Amino acid sequence: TQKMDFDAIIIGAGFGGLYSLKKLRDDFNLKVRAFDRATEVGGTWFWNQYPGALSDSETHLYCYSWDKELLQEMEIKRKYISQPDVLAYLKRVADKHDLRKDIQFETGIRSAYFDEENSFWNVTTENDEKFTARFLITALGPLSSPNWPIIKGIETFKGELHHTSRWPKDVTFSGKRVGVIGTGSTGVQVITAIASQVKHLTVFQRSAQYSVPIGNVVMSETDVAKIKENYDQIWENVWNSALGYGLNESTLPTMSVSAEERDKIFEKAWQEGGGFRFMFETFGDIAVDETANIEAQNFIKKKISEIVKDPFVAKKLTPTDLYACRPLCDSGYYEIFNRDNVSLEDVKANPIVEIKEDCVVTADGVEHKLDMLICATGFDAVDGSYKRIDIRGKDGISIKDHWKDGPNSYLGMMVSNFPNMFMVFGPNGPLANSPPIIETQVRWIADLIGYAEDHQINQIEATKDAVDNWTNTCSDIANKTLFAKAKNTVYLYMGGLKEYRNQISEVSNNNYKGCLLKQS
Ligand SMILES: Cc1cc2nc3c(=O)[nH]c(=O)nc-3n(C[C@H](O)[C@H](O)[C@H](O)COP(=O)(O)OP(=O)(O)OC[C@H]3O[C@@H](n4cnc5c(N)ncnc54)[C@H](O)[C@@H]3O)c2cc1C
Ligand SMILES: NC(=O)C1=CN([C@@H]2O[C@H](COP(=O)(O)OP(=O)(O)OC[C@H]3O[C@@H](n4cnc5c(N)ncnc54)[C@H](O)[C@@H]3O)[C@@H](O)[C@H]2O)C=CC1
């Protein structure tokens, strides 16, 4: 009966898809084919090429760890790695391991239907090409379709209108009046990078957020060669940590030291740089205790009032949140608002009501004349990338229907009613550095598929109770955190990378409890 085109089909050629291809094809000798709409590997690092695109984690850790030779060969130019260098790195990964011969570029996957009779997947591209594979590996990433601001007359603007997710080449800023909507991580990076290049910059800020310096500096040859000399212990620290950012994750309570010592600890992380460092290397209860969280707020607020000299602009930049989850990272964001060519518009108190052929109009009637409008307004949720595909498992239920109230899964990798489908960097996963999470899930999925090939089972599916057990574990951990109060279905597992690896290890050791292994 079953002919089958491949043993596994992968959707995505980013960090998750490239390692899924390497592990399944070369270490388990399976017949694999990967698909991506992009013309080249990279994932978000191919799509997102906006000004100032920079990694949150340091260069020596935002990479693969499974190729020891690649680690020694790796270019560590600056403390953090820019978008063109991440793209070049992932291209080198594809070059060394001969990955492109099994990737079909310029090809979008329209639908994936599970055949309960033969226990494989019917995958159809957007160009009506049909492939069959026993297993479906979905490496879609954490971000979905670009989120545009719903503003009356947005289609009327005659100037340049760019979304940061679709940043075109050859964009020039000199002599232009530019506006930026959005002050998230992407907006902060764009604003800091282009303020000195434009004639005038207007920042349309709906919600001011906390941001700490990133401290991106050049890495000397002694800085680099010494990292590669201790790379084995560095990665052992990652697997033994909660975030995988190479931090000395603190257990010290914030209010257990004096105000003078508390200031020294915050200042030390402020000088070194890093958003996760300021939160989790300083003290161990910043995300848990309200009094601790407020202390971290007041340090950044004090830094804002000192950097921007106009106290009324500093007031507009100061977040009104009672509690603060994650701060952003910047390379001179607050210094930008001291410039003569930068205007900050509080769009919560003075909302945008309309934009015309040459301007953005706020509620006060002021027409902000612009030659270019940049929308750094974010994306849809992680489950959007899945609901954007026509995925149907048992009985024909679509992932649109099964996740109509939000995403749920088992260990962040398996979905009930969708057998032989394994998610890489999917929802309900851990909150940590992405490459360590991706590597952890790809190795776990590959070991289960190899365990399947030897024990002659052809269908793997997580039970409904195992998924609901995972939702309880995530909610039990998250409700101990202030992350629930500030900005049912639980989107993230918050136990850390080490405890997440403990969770999935107990499953693989206990004969994959919660999963249903059908023999043939
Ligand atoms: C500028 C920037 C900096 C970041 N820095 C960090 C950091 O320091 N630390 C960290 O942990 N995380 C960071 N992230 C987030 C995260 O690490 C990245 O998204 C990471 O590359 C994960 O990639 P991925 O391979 O899981 O998915 P992606 O890189 O998003 O790859 C998804 C791919 O799947 C393809 N695809 C989706 N649907 C279909 C379909 N139906 N058919 C065909 N193809 C499809 C898409 O074309 C896309 O290329 C950052 C993100 C950005 C944008
Ligand atoms: N350095 C890094 O590691 C990076 C990380 N990321 C991640 O990717 C995700 C995407 O983040 P971003 O692209 O920054 O988007 P975001 O969702 O973080 O920010 C969107 C911004 O646009 C504003 N906005 C949205 N709709 C609006 C409207 N109608 N009117 C006015 N303002 C509006 C919001 O106030 C918000 O500040 C983030 O969660 C982030 O963690 C993204 C880029 C870089």
Coordinates of C-alpha atoms and ligand atoms in Angstrom, one line a residue:
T1 CA 0.0 0.0 0.0
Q2 CA 1.7 3.1 1.4
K3 CA 4.2 4.5 -1.2
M4 CA 4.9 7.9 0.5
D5 CA 7.0 10.6 -1.0
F6 CA 9.0 11.3 2.2
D7 CA 9.4 10.2 5.8
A8 CA 8.9 13.7 7.0
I9 CA 7.9 17.1 5.5
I10 CA 9.2 20.3 7.2
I11 CA 7.6 23.7 6.8
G12 CA 10.2 26.5 7.4
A13 CA 13.9 27.1 6.6
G14 CA 14.8 29.2 9.6
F15 CA 16.6 28.2 12.8
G16 CA 14.0 25.5 13.6
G17 CA 13.6 24.1 10.1
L18 CA 17.3 23.9 9.2
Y19 CA 18.1 21.8 12.3
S20 CA 15.0 19.7 11.8
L21 CA 16.3 18.9 8.3
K22 CA 19.8 18.1 9.5
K23 CA 18.7 15.9 12.4
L24 CA 16.1 13.9 10.5
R25 CA 18.0 13.5 7.2
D26 CA 21.6 13.0 8.3
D27 CA 21.4 11.6 11.9
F28 CA 18.4 9.3 11.3
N29 CA 18.8 8.7 7.5
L30 CA 15.2 9.7 6.8
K31 CA 13.9 11.0 3.5
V32 CA 13.0 14.6 4.1
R33 CA 11.8 17.7 2.1
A34 CA 11.5 21.2 3.5
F35 CA 9.4 24.1 2.2
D36 CA 9.5 27.8 2.6
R37 CA 8.0 30.8 0.8
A38 CA 11.4 32.5 1.1
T39 CA 14.0 32.3 -1.7
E40 CA 16.7 31.5 0.8
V41 CA 17.3 30.1 4.3
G42 CA 17.0 32.4 7.3
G43 CA 13.4 32.6 8.5
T44 CA 12.8 35.9 10.2
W45 CA 16.4 36.8 9.5
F46 CA 15.6 36.7 5.8
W47 CA 12.3 38.5 6.0
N48 CA 13.1 41.2 8.7
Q49 CA 15.8 43.5 7.3
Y50 CA 14.6 46.8 8.9
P51 CA 17.2 49.4 10.2
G52 CA 18.7 48.4 13.5
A53 CA 17.6 44.7 13.4
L54 CA 19.7 43.2 16.2
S55 CA 19.6 40.0 18.3
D56 CA 18.5 40.1 22.0
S57 CA 21.0 37.4 23.0
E58 CA 24.8 37.8 22.6
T59 CA 26.5 36.6 19.5
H60 CA 28.3 33.6 20.9
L61 CA 24.9 32.2 22.2
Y62 CA 22.5 33.1 19.3
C63 CA 23.7 30.2 17.2
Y64 CA 23.7 26.4 17.0
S65 CA 25.6 24.3 19.6
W66 CA 25.5 20.9 17.9
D67 CA 28.4 21.6 15.5
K68 CA 31.5 22.0 17.5
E69 CA 33.6 22.9 14.4
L70 CA 31.2 25.6 13.5
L71 CA 31.5 27.1 17.0
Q72 CA 35.3 27.4 16.6
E73 CA 34.8 28.7 13.0
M74 CA 32.1 31.3 14.0
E75 CA 32.5 35.0 13.4
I76 CA 32.0 36.9 16.7
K77 CA 32.3 40.5 15.4
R78 CA 30.3 42.4 18.0
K79 CA 28.7 41.5 21.4
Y80 CA 25.4 41.2 19.6
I81 CA 24.8 40.1 16.0
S82 CA 23.0 42.1 13.3
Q83 CA 20.5 40.8 10.8
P84 CA 22.9 40.5 7.8
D85 CA 25.3 38.6 9.9
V86 CA 22.7 36.1 11.2
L87 CA 21.5 35.6 7.7
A88 CA 25.1 35.0 6.6
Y89 CA 25.6 32.6 9.5
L90 CA 22.5 30.5 8.6
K91 CA 23.5 30.4 4.9
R92 CA 26.9 29.0 6.0
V93 CA 25.1 26.3 8.0
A94 CA 23.2 25.4 4.8
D95 CA 26.5 25.4 2.9
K96 CA 28.5 23.2 5.2
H97 CA 25.7 20.6 5.7
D98 CA 24.4 20.5 2.1
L99 CA 20.8 21.5 3.2
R100 CA 19.5 23.4 0.2
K101 CA 19.3 20.3 -2.0
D102 CA 16.3 19.2 0.2
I103 CA 14.6 22.6 0.5
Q104 CA 12.0 23.7 -1.9
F105 CA 12.2 27.5 -1.9
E106 CA 9.5 29.9 -3.3
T107 CA 6.9 27.4 -2.2
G108 CA 4.2 28.0 0.3
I109 CA 2.3 25.2 2.0
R110 CA -1.5 25.8 1.6
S111 CA -2.9 22.7 3.4
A112 CA -1.9 19.6 5.3
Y113 CA -4.6 16.8 5.6
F114 CA -4.0 13.8 7.8
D115 CA -5.0 10.4 6.2
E116 CA -6.2 8.2 9.0
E117 CA -6.4 5.3 6.6
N118 CA -2.7 5.2 5.7
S119 CA -1.5 7.3 8.8
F120 CA 0.4 9.9 6.8
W121 CA -0.1 13.6 5.8
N122 CA -1.4 15.0 2.5
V123 CA 0.5 18.3 2.1
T124 CA -0.5 20.6 -0.7
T125 CA 1.5 23.6 -1.7
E126 CA 0.0 26.9 -2.8
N127 CA 0.7 25.8 -6.3
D128 CA -1.3 22.6 -6.2
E129 CA 1.7 20.3 -5.8
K130 CA 0.9 17.4 -3.5
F131 CA 3.4 15.5 -1.4
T132 CA 2.9 12.6 1.1
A133 CA 4.9 12.1 4.3
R134 CA 4.5 10.1 7.5
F135 CA 5.4 13.0 9.8
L136 CA 4.8 16.7 9.6
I137 CA 7.4 19.0 11.1
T138 CA 6.1 22.6 11.5
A139 CA 8.8 25.2 12.1
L140 CA 6.8 28.3 11.5
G141 CA 8.3 30.6 14.1
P142 CA 6.7 32.7 16.9
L143 CA 5.3 35.5 14.7
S144 CA 2.5 35.5 12.2
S145 CA 1.1 37.9 9.7
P146 CA 2.2 41.6 9.9
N147 CA -0.1 43.7 12.1
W148 CA -1.0 47.0 10.4
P149 CA -2.6 49.8 12.4
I150 CA -6.4 50.1 11.7
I151 CA -6.4 53.9 10.9
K152 CA -8.9 55.6 8.7
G153 CA -7.4 56.6 5.3
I154 CA -4.2 54.6 5.6
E155 CA -4.6 53.7 1.9
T156 CA -4.7 57.4 1.1
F157 CA -1.0 58.1 2.0
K158 CA 1.0 59.0 -1.2
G159 CA 4.4 58.9 0.4
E160 CA 6.5 55.9 1.4
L161 CA 4.6 53.4 3.6
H162 CA 6.7 50.6 5.0
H163 CA 6.1 47.9 7.5
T164 CA 9.2 46.7 9.4
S165 CA 8.4 43.1 8.5
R166 CA 8.6 44.0 4.7
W167 CA 11.4 46.5 4.7
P168 CA 12.5 47.1 1.1
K169 CA 16.0 47.7 -0.1
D170 CA 17.4 51.1 -1.2
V171 CA 15.4 53.1 1.3
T172 CA 17.0 56.6 1.8
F173 CA 16.2 58.9 4.8
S174 CA 18.2 62.1 4.0
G175 CA 16.0 65.2 3.8
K176 CA 12.8 63.4 4.5
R177 CA 10.2 63.8 7.2
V178 CA 9.6 60.4 8.7
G179 CA 7.1 59.0 11.1
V180 CA 7.3 55.8 13.2
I181 CA 4.2 54.1 14.7
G182 CA 5.1 51.7 17.5
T183 CA 7.7 51.8 20.3
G184 CA 8.2 48.1 20.8
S185 CA 11.5 46.2 20.4
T186 CA 11.4 46.7 16.6
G187 CA 10.2 50.4 16.8
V188 CA 13.0 51.2 19.4
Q189 CA 15.6 49.7 17.1
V190 CA 14.3 51.6 14.0
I191 CA 14.0 54.9 15.8
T192 CA 17.5 54.7 17.3
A193 CA 19.0 53.8 13.9
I194 CA 17.3 56.4 11.7
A195 CA 16.9 59.5 13.9
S196 CA 20.3 60.9 12.8
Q197 CA 19.6 60.2 9.1
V198 CA 16.2 62.0 8.6
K199 CA 15.3 65.6 8.4
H200 CA 12.7 65.2 11.1
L201 CA 11.4 62.2 13.0
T202 CA 7.9 62.0 14.7
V203 CA 7.4 59.0 17.0
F204 CA 3.8 58.0 17.5
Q205 CA 3.8 56.3 20.9
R206 CA 0.7 54.5 22.3
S207 CA 2.4 52.8 25.2
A208 CA 5.8 53.8 26.6
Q209 CA 7.9 50.8 27.6
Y210 CA 11.0 50.3 29.7
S211 CA 14.3 49.9 27.9
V212 CA 17.8 49.3 29.1
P213 CA 21.1 49.7 27.2
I214 CA 22.2 46.6 25.2
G215 CA 25.9 47.5 25.4
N216 CA 26.7 46.3 21.8
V217 CA 30.5 46.6 21.6
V218 CA 33.1 45.2 19.3
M219 CA 34.7 42.0 20.4
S220 CA 38.5 41.8 20.5
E221 CA 40.4 38.8 19.3
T222 CA 41.2 38.0 23.0
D223 CA 37.5 38.3 23.8
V224 CA 36.6 35.9 21.0
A225 CA 39.4 33.3 21.2
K226 CA 38.8 33.0 24.9
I227 CA 35.1 32.3 24.4
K228 CA 35.9 29.5 21.9
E229 CA 38.4 28.1 24.4
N230 CA 35.6 27.7 27.0
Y231 CA 32.7 27.0 24.7
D232 CA 32.0 23.6 26.2
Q233 CA 31.4 25.0 29.7
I234 CA 29.4 27.9 28.2
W235 CA 26.9 25.6 26.6
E236 CA 26.7 23.4 29.7
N237 CA 25.7 26.6 31.6
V238 CA 23.0 27.2 29.0
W239 CA 21.4 23.7 29.4
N240 CA 21.7 24.2 33.2
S241 CA 20.0 27.6 33.2
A242 CA 16.4 28.9 33.0
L243 CA 16.9 31.4 30.1
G244 CA 20.0 30.2 28.2
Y245 CA 21.3 33.8 27.9
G246 CA 24.6 33.1 29.6
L247 CA 23.5 35.0 32.7
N248 CA 24.4 34.5 36.4
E249 CA 20.7 34.0 37.1
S250 CA 20.2 35.5 40.6
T251 CA 18.4 34.1 43.6
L252 CA 18.9 37.2 45.7
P253 CA 15.7 39.0 46.8
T254 CA 15.6 42.7 45.8
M255 CA 14.5 44.1 49.2
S256 CA 17.1 42.0 51.1
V257 CA 19.9 44.6 50.5
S258 CA 20.2 48.3 51.3
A259 CA 19.1 51.1 48.9
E260 CA 22.8 51.9 48.2
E261 CA 23.6 48.2 47.4
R262 CA 20.5 47.8 45.4
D263 CA 21.6 50.8 43.3
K264 CA 25.0 49.3 42.7
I265 CA 23.5 46.1 41.5
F266 CA 21.2 47.7 39.0
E267 CA 23.9 50.1 37.8
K268 CA 26.3 47.1 37.2
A269 CA 23.7 45.4 34.9
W270 CA 22.9 48.8 33.3
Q271 CA 26.5 49.3 32.4
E272 CA 27.0 45.7 31.1
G273 CA 23.7 45.8 29.1
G274 CA 20.9 43.4 28.3
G275 CA 17.2 43.3 29.1
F276 CA 17.2 39.8 30.5
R277 CA 20.3 40.6 32.5
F278 CA 18.7 43.7 34.2
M279 CA 15.7 41.5 35.2
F280 CA 17.2 38.2 36.2
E281 CA 21.0 38.7 36.9
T282 CA 20.4 41.6 39.4
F283 CA 17.8 39.9 41.6
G284 CA 15.7 36.8 41.7
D285 CA 12.2 38.1 42.5
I286 CA 11.8 41.0 40.1
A287 CA 9.2 39.2 38.0
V288 CA 7.5 37.7 41.2
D289 CA 7.4 40.4 43.9
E290 CA 5.5 43.7 43.4
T291 CA 7.8 45.7 45.6
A292 CA 10.8 44.2 43.8
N293 CA 9.3 45.0 40.4
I294 CA 8.6 48.6 41.4
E295 CA 12.2 49.0 42.5
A296 CA 13.4 48.0 39.0
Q297 CA 10.9 50.4 37.5
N298 CA 12.2 53.3 39.5
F299 CA 15.8 52.7 38.5
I300 CA 14.9 52.9 34.8
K301 CA 12.6 55.8 35.4
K302 CA 15.4 57.6 37.1
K303 CA 17.7 56.8 34.2
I304 CA 15.1 58.3 31.8
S305 CA 14.8 61.5 33.8
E306 CA 18.6 61.9 33.7
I307 CA 19.1 61.1 30.0
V308 CA 16.5 63.1 28.3
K309 CA 16.9 66.7 29.5
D310 CA 13.4 68.1 28.8
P311 CA 11.5 66.9 31.8
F312 CA 8.2 67.0 29.9
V313 CA 9.5 64.7 27.1
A314 CA 11.0 62.4 29.8
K315 CA 7.5 62.3 31.4
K316 CA 6.0 61.2 28.1
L317 CA 8.7 58.5 27.8
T318 CA 8.1 57.2 31.3
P319 CA 5.8 54.1 31.4
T320 CA 2.6 54.4 33.4
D321 CA 2.4 50.7 34.0
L322 CA 2.0 49.8 37.7
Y323 CA 4.0 46.6 37.0
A324 CA 6.6 46.0 34.4
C325 CA 7.3 42.7 32.6
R326 CA 10.2 42.7 30.1
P327 CA 12.2 45.7 29.2
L328 CA 13.5 46.3 25.7
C329 CA 17.1 46.7 24.7
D330 CA 18.4 49.8 22.8
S331 CA 21.6 51.4 21.5
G332 CA 20.8 55.0 22.4
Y333 CA 17.0 55.2 22.3
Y334 CA 16.4 57.8 25.0
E335 CA 19.3 59.9 23.8
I336 CA 17.4 60.3 20.5
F337 CA 14.7 62.5 22.1
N338 CA 17.2 65.2 23.0
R339 CA 17.7 65.9 19.3
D340 CA 16.2 69.0 17.6
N341 CA 14.8 66.9 14.8
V342 CA 12.8 64.4 16.9
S343 CA 9.2 65.0 18.1
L344 CA 7.4 62.6 20.5
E345 CA 3.6 62.3 20.2
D346 CA 1.7 60.6 23.0
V347 CA -0.9 58.9 20.8
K348 CA -2.8 57.5 23.8
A349 CA -3.8 61.0 25.0
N350 CA -3.7 62.4 21.4
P351 CA -4.7 59.5 19.2
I352 CA -4.3 59.3 15.4
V353 CA -7.8 59.8 13.9
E354 CA -6.9 59.9 10.2
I355 CA -4.0 60.0 7.7
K356 CA -4.2 61.7 4.3
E357 CA -2.1 61.9 1.2
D358 CA 0.7 63.8 2.9
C359 CA 0.2 63.6 6.7
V360 CA -0.9 61.9 9.8
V361 CA -3.7 63.7 11.6
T362 CA -4.0 63.4 15.4
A363 CA -7.1 64.1 17.5
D364 CA -6.0 67.7 18.2
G365 CA -6.3 68.4 14.5
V366 CA -2.6 68.8 13.9
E367 CA -1.4 67.5 10.5
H368 CA 2.0 65.8 10.8
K369 CA 3.4 66.1 7.3
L370 CA 5.4 63.0 6.4
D371 CA 7.4 61.8 3.4
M372 CA 7.6 58.3 4.9
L373 CA 5.5 56.4 7.4
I374 CA 7.1 53.4 9.1
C375 CA 4.7 50.9 10.8
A376 CA 6.5 48.9 13.6
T377 CA 3.1 47.8 14.9
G378 CA 3.9 44.1 15.5
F379 CA 2.5 40.8 14.3
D380 CA -0.3 38.4 15.0
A381 CA 0.1 35.8 17.8
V382 CA 2.2 32.6 17.3
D383 CA -0.9 30.4 16.6
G384 CA -1.6 32.6 13.6
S385 CA 1.0 30.9 11.5
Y386 CA -0.7 27.6 12.2
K387 CA -4.3 28.9 11.6
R388 CA -3.0 30.5 8.4
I389 CA -2.4 27.0 7.1
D390 CA -5.3 24.6 6.3
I391 CA -4.3 21.9 8.7
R392 CA -6.8 19.0 9.3
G393 CA -6.1 16.0 11.4
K394 CA -8.4 13.3 12.7
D395 CA -12.1 13.6 11.8
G396 CA -11.1 16.6 9.7
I397 CA -11.0 19.2 12.5
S398 CA -9.0 22.2 11.4
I399 CA -6.4 23.8 13.6
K400 CA -8.5 26.9 13.0
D401 CA -11.3 25.2 14.9
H402 CA -9.3 23.3 17.5
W403 CA -7.5 26.5 18.5
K404 CA -10.5 28.9 18.2
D405 CA -10.0 29.9 21.8
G406 CA -6.2 29.9 21.8
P407 CA -3.3 27.4 21.4
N408 CA -2.9 24.3 23.6
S409 CA -0.5 21.5 23.2
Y410 CA 1.6 18.8 25.0
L411 CA 5.1 19.9 25.9
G412 CA 4.8 22.7 23.2
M413 CA 5.4 20.1 20.5
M414 CA 2.2 17.9 20.0
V415 CA -1.4 18.8 19.5
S416 CA -4.4 16.5 20.2
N417 CA -6.4 15.4 17.1
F418 CA -3.3 16.1 14.9
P419 CA -1.2 12.9 14.8
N420 CA 2.3 12.7 13.5
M421 CA 2.6 16.5 13.6
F422 CA 5.4 17.9 15.7
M423 CA 5.8 21.6 16.4
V424 CA 9.3 23.3 16.6
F425 CA 9.3 26.5 18.6
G426 CA 5.5 26.2 18.9
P427 CA 3.2 27.6 21.4
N428 CA 3.1 26.6 25.1
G429 CA 6.9 26.3 25.0
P430 CA 9.6 27.6 27.3
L431 CA 10.6 31.3 27.7
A432 CA 14.3 31.3 27.0
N433 CA 16.8 31.8 24.2
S434 CA 15.5 30.5 20.9
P435 CA 18.3 28.3 19.5
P436 CA 18.6 26.2 22.7
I437 CA 14.8 25.7 22.7
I438 CA 14.8 24.8 19.0
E439 CA 17.7 22.3 19.5
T440 CA 16.0 20.8 22.5
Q441 CA 12.7 20.2 20.7
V442 CA 14.3 19.0 17.4
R443 CA 16.4 16.4 19.3
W444 CA 13.4 15.2 21.3
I445 CA 11.2 14.9 18.2
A446 CA 13.9 13.1 16.2
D447 CA 14.4 10.6 19.1
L448 CA 10.7 9.9 19.2
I449 CA 10.5 9.4 15.4
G450 CA 13.5 7.1 15.6
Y451 CA 11.9 5.3 18.5
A452 CA 8.9 5.0 16.2
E453 CA 10.8 3.6 13.2
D454 CA 12.3 0.8 15.3
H455 CA 9.1 -0.3 17.2
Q456 CA 7.1 -0.4 14.0
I457 CA 4.5 2.3 15.0
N458 CA 3.0 4.5 12.4
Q459 CA 0.8 7.0 14.4
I460 CA 1.9 9.2 17.3
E461 CA -0.7 11.5 19.0
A462 CA -0.9 13.2 22.3
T463 CA -4.0 12.5 24.4
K464 CA -6.5 15.2 25.3
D465 CA -5.7 14.7 29.0
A466 CA -1.9 15.2 28.4
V467 CA -2.6 18.5 26.7
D468 CA -4.8 19.7 29.5
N469 CA -2.2 18.5 32.0
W470 CA 0.3 20.7 30.2
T471 CA -2.0 23.7 30.4
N472 CA -2.3 23.2 34.2
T473 CA 1.4 23.0 34.6
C474 CA 1.9 26.2 32.6
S475 CA -0.9 28.1 34.4
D476 CA 0.4 26.8 37.8
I477 CA 3.8 28.3 37.1
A478 CA 2.6 31.5 35.4
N479 CA 0.2 32.4 38.2
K480 CA 3.2 32.6 40.5
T481 CA 4.5 35.4 38.3
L482 CA 3.7 39.0 37.8
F483 CA 3.8 38.3 34.0
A484 CA 0.1 37.4 34.3
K485 CA -0.9 40.7 35.8
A486 CA 0.6 43.0 33.2
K487 CA 0.6 42.5 29.4
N488 CA -8.2 29.2 29.6
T489 CA -5.2 29.1 27.3
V490 CA -1.7 29.6 28.6
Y491 CA 0.8 30.7 25.9
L492 CA 4.1 30.1 27.6
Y493 CA 5.8 27.5 29.8
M494 CA 7.6 29.6 32.4
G495 CA 9.7 27.0 34.3
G496 CA 12.9 27.7 32.4
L497 CA 15.0 25.8 29.9
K498 CA 16.4 23.3 32.4
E499 CA 13.1 22.4 34.0
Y500 CA 11.5 22.2 30.5
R501 CA 14.2 19.7 29.5
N502 CA 13.4 17.9 32.7
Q503 CA 9.7 17.7 31.8
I504 CA 10.2 16.3 28.3
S505 CA 12.9 13.9 29.6
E506 CA 10.4 12.3 32.0
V507 CA 8.0 11.8 29.1
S508 CA 10.6 10.1 26.8
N509 CA 11.9 8.0 29.7
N510 CA 8.4 6.8 30.8
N511 CA 7.6 5.4 27.3
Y512 CA 6.1 8.7 26.1
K513 CA 3.3 8.8 28.6
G514 CA 0.4 11.0 27.3
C515 CA 1.1 9.9 23.7
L516 CA -0.7 7.2 21.8
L517 CA 1.6 4.8 19.8
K518 CA -0.4 2.8 17.2
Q519 CA 1.3 -0.3 15.9
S520 CA 1.1 -1.6 12.3
Ligands
LIG1 C1 15.4 41.0 14.9 C2 15.1 39.8 15.7 C3 15.9 39.5 16.8 C4 15.7 38.4 17.6 N1 16.5 38.1 18.6 C5 16.3 37.0 19.3 C6 17.2 36.6 20.5 O1 18.2 37.3 20.7 N2 16.9 35.5 21.2 C7 15.8 34.8 21.0 O2 15.6 33.8 21.7 N3 14.9 35.1 20.0 C8 15.1 36.1 19.1 N4 14.2 36.4 18.1 C9 13.0 35.6 17.8 C10 13.3 34.2 17.3 O3 14.6 33.7 17.9 C11 13.4 34.1 15.8 O4 12.1 34.1 15.3 C12 14.1 32.8 15.5 O5 14.8 33.0 14.2 C13 13.2 31.6 15.4 O6 13.1 31.2 14.0 P1 12.3 29.8 13.6 O7 13.2 29.1 12.6 O8 11.7 29.1 14.8 O9 11.1 30.4 12.7 P2 11.3 31.6 11.6 O10 12.7 32.1 11.6 O11 10.2 32.6 11.8 O12 11.0 30.8 10.3 C14 9.7 30.5 9.8 C15 9.7 30.2 8.4 O13 8.6 29.4 8.0 C16 8.1 29.8 6.8 N5 6.6 29.5 6.6 C17 5.7 29.7 7.5 N6 4.5 29.3 7.1 C18 4.7 28.7 5.9 C19 3.8 28.0 4.8 N7 2.5 27.9 5.0 N8 4.5 27.6 3.7 C20 5.8 27.7 3.5 N9 6.6 28.3 4.4 C21 6.1 28.8 5.6 C22 8.3 31.3 6.7 O14 8.5 31.8 5.4 C23 9.5 31.5 7.5 O15 10.7 31.7 6.7 C24 14.5 37.6 17.3 C25 13.6 37.9 16.2 C26 13.9 39.0 15.5 C27 12.9 39.4 14.3
LIG2 N1 15.6 42.5 19.6 C1 14.8 41.4 19.6 O1 15.0 40.4 20.2 C2 13.5 41.5 18.9 C3 12.4 40.8 19.3 N2 11.2 40.9 18.7 C4 10.1 40.1 19.2 O2 9.1 40.1 18.2 C5 7.8 40.5 18.7 C6 7.3 41.7 17.8 O3 7.6 42.9 18.5 P1 7.5 44.3 17.7 O4 7.7 44.0 16.2 O5 8.3 45.3 18.4 O6 6.0 44.7 17.9 P2 5.3 44.8 19.3 O7 3.9 44.1 19.3 O8 6.3 44.4 20.4 O9 5.0 46.4 19.4 C7 4.0 46.9 18.6 C8 4.0 48.4 18.9 O10 3.1 49.1 18.0 C9 2.2 49.9 18.7 N3 0.8 49.9 18.0 C10 0.2 48.8 17.6 N4 -1.0 49.1 17.0 C11 -1.1 50.4 17.1 C12 -2.1 51.4 16.7 N5 -3.3 51.1 16.1 N6 -1.8 52.8 16.9 C13 -0.7 53.1 17.5 N7 0.2 52.3 17.9 C14 0.1 51.0 17.7 C15 2.1 49.4 20.1 O11 1.9 50.5 21.1 C16 3.4 48.7 20.3 O12 4.3 49.6 21.0 C17 8.0 41.1 20.2 O13 7.3 40.3 21.1 C18 9.5 40.9 20.4 O14 9.7 40.2 21.6 C19 11.1 41.6 17.6 C20 12.1 42.3 17.0 C21 13.4 42.4 17.6

